[PDB]
């Protein structure tokens, strides 16, 4: 098992990549995995320990920069668009 | 009542079409520059709004 990390998940036979985390949702015994509106999976039960977990897709986002002007100076600063600062350095 | 602003949207068209697949991403490059044209149109929409 892997938890709280960007990984890929298969479970009963479906596919997806993201981060797993503990979930507050309570499912009925027949329920296998949670599906959100527009037909996108968001929750899945662990078949071994019989525990439900949430699904968060990979923290995608475009990269943007700011610049006062080429002829003004050569310095520059960069803005990451809608990403938490915790996992930024994965940029390589 | 007069509407003045709509939630501006931008799309990672490479991700939307190819679905982060290497060969799929390679193939779409043969269709020219719709990729960048649509992105710049959307960013123009946002800045204009």
């Amino acid at each position: 098992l892997v938890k709280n990390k960007c990984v890929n998940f298969n479970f009963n036979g479906l596919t997806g990549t993201g981060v797993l985390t503990e979930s507050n949702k309570k499912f009925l015994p027949f329920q296998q995995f949670g599906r959100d509106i527009a037909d996108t999976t968001d929750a899945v039960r662990d078949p071994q320990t019989l525990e439900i977990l949430d699904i968060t897709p990979c923290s995608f986002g475009g990269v943007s920069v700011i610049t006062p002007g080429t002829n003004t100076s050569n310095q520059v600063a960069v803005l990451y668009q809608d990403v938490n600062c915790t996992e930024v350095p994965v940029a390589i | 009542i007069l509407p003045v602003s709509m939630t501006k949207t931008s799309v990672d068209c490479t991700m939307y079409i190819c679905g982060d697949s290497t060969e799929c991403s390679n193939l779409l490059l043969q269709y020219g520059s719709f990729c960048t044209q649509l992105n710049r149109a959307l960013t123009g929409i946002a800045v204009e709004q």
Binding site: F60, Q81, D82 | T7, A46
Partner: peptide, 25 residues
């Protein structure tokens, strides 16, 4: 504001914050 109410990021789709916030407007 309390009367008006109906998304998030899913699979490449993005939403960008407004230039001016509700406090500023």
């Amino acid at each position: 504001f309390n009367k008006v109410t109906l998304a998030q990021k899913f699979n490449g789709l993005t939403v960008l914050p407004p230039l001016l916030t509700d406090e500023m407007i």
